[model samples]
Target: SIRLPAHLRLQPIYWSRDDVAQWLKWAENEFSLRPIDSNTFEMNGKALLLLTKEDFRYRSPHSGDELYELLQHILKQRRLPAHLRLQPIYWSRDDVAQWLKWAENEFSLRPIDSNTFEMNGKALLLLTKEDFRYRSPHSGDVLYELLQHILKQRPSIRLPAHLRLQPIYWSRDDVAQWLKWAENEFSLRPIDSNTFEMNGKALLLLTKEDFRYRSPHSGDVLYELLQHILGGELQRKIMEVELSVHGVTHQEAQTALGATGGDVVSAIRNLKVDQLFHLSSRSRADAWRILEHYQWDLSAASRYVL
Candidate 1:
């Protein structure tokens, strides 16, 4: 039932024509996008890398825009730094307009009226499919689908370190504020505060049934938020413990714990591999390659590297 993402050893810039075709077919199948004529894009990675969004659309009208966006994301693993990257929630009116233009160009949708969308990202999020339909009529369905796809692809929103707390310690007031913020952040349907009028202790105890019974539309979103909040706190605590008790530096501890899903034992072993590799080998990059080769198995890596 679980499908992990494929680890592509070949970078996008170096892909062969066949590789490009393979990726397009994979993307189409996985995302249920319109079937693209791979023969039309018979270019090597070098040529593929140079294509602009407009060029992509010129080549394949139906799925080109989405393919371009996905390819760009793959080419650049990092989005802008969190502080510099304005999340959709923080987008201003002008920012929203710029995004609107991007949408119009990418999807070939009719230009949405600026007056209809002269609102910030916060307001934009609250608009439902009906709102889009009422505004643009024809382009509304595509617009709504595109928005949902982007939102769904995004990593769950992370609170700045200062704002995050272990859920158990939250006051009812804290819970309310967090809930409001999360609803906006995730574009969840409006959650009634009275339905969830409980402190962090009770909040932690809530089962899936509780959320579904209270807010049927946003129940899954809220549950996912709960897991993320708890998971983040666990990561923080493990990082702290690794630093304080094991003399691991914050950066190494963070990387190890992140790779190990905050599993202290696995993190310890991952760090040990680095420690062992550095004793004889030089490049941390090489050490990471070795670690990955051995699938992070301490004994296996030790047998080969040591």
Candidate 2:
């Protein structure tokens, strides 16, 4: 089995009458402010209320209390039958059983009794059916299919904002088969890791180490450091690279240099000297000497730089 990335789980909501009333009031007031007719207002208000409730049921609909109540009502009805195994699909009996178990455990629904199983609630029916093969109408995918079906059938059901549909789990062999199919169907390119290409229009670098000197906490420290160490033009060039290359926003640039413990100034200084050496057409031996001296902090007689 493939280990997938961490996923978010949605919980169904149970709203009270007072909660529904509050949502209605908020929706009505908001709609009243709009320049629409009474018929439109009624339609909008009713739709909003229903949509709100639907959000609660699915743990991802829209925001508001009415949706919460609708969700609660759906969850409370326990008279639904499990119709998953009867469906014809890719899922096996075991798969349906496993899915049901997961859904029940995650939703904190009442335990299913084999002898006295009562499936009276719409939610119970929908969730159980979904465990089988419910596809979303809106997204045209299995995950979305189930959600859309449920929402359309029960318009008052609500879901949370972050709720998302997930793909069925696949085995490693299945994944390999899928990849092979993708390669053949898409005519994708295979990248070679051995060679470095210099044909890119732009390059960006992200380093985890501090590159600046003179903490932003000390006023004029960076300015003085740059003026003394790198001069104005080099400083400006480094700043431009930081912004353009890294796509650093004004706030990010400020934070990169000015934030506590940021050392972008020092990084720029080192980079500037390196570039200058490269531009001067320094011989390999001379460059090695300079690098060894600067990087290793070696003495002139050691010939470590050479």
Candidate 3:
């Protein structure tokens, strides 16, 4: 730290009791001041000059001819241990778990419990953000060049801010709570003259005019020790030709299939047409949020319906 300028120093004040500096604690902390604008609180007194917190950081003194810059090399390979607080990516282990589960269900990713995966049969360990930002010291293959290509695509952006995803290996009951919690937090929003909540865009996870079937949203919940198991990898890809088997033309097939990321099953879903419109959007009010709160997770509620 450099020596502070003389003008910035203050004479200490005897700050005391319930009645101090006319209730402005800031006045005592600052270099003392004389008041005014009570016009003439006894003839003609002086006024106080003000300074704010911004002056604290901006006033640092440094920099000149010879600047610090990395010339090059001699950097050795090493792994830094993962810590609890990862800023900007994830703040805690819980957050890491949330992203992990979402990726597992979203991509059918291999087990990451071991902290690595078999890329081409050899175990590829998880790399930190720095490794991906530039070069991985172990492989020396730099990703600095691939930054632009990697940035072109954005995935799962509908995710709420300050919210972590559920674990990937969740049960029907787990999904029940998942939908319920999501609804309670992010619930609904207005779109056009109606209301709409985006799903994946991938598709929006709400009722739409094109949903061939109207599904009720029962509140989130469930339970058991059955040891029973069931699951689906919704990310499985489906081709345009597979979708075309239903009779739409090449262009129609391509558009719909593309909309669903080439998944025939998702592509074949009813199209939003001239005759249709959104449920909550047209229904009016905060009905979308109401509808969300009333949703049903079919898999989670299967036993009752069955």
Clashes of each: 0, 43, 14
Candidate 1 residue-wise lDDT at 271: 80
Candidate 3's displacement at residue 98, Å, is: 18
Provide the lowest-lDDT 10-residue window in model 1. Answer: 78-87
> How far out, in Å, is residue 56 in model 2?
11
The C-alpha lDDT values of all candidates are 0.64, 0.32, 0.26
Every model's TM-score:
0.30, 0.18, 0.17
Quote the RMSD, in angstroms, for model 2. Answer: 22.4
Indicate which candidate wins on TM-score: 1
| Model 1 spans > 4 angstroms off | 1-89, 93-105, 109-165, 181-189, 201-261, 264-306
Candidate 2 structure quality by residue, lDDT tens digits, 189-276: 2212211121111111111111111111111222222233223333343455464323344444444444323466544333334443
Ranking by lDDT: 1, 2, 3
Best by lDDT: 1
TM-score, cand. 2 vs. native: 0.18
Q: Model 1, clash count?
A: 0
Per-residue CA lDDT of model 1 for 1-306, tens digit only, reads: 423135334677667666777888878887898887766665556556656686577567988899899888778862223331466677766776676666665444445776556555655665656555555564554555556655766664566465488675778987787778766665555677767789876676666567657866555446546754455345444544464334577566777777888677767766866675666455767766776787765456667876
Candidate 1 local distance difference test against the native: 0.64
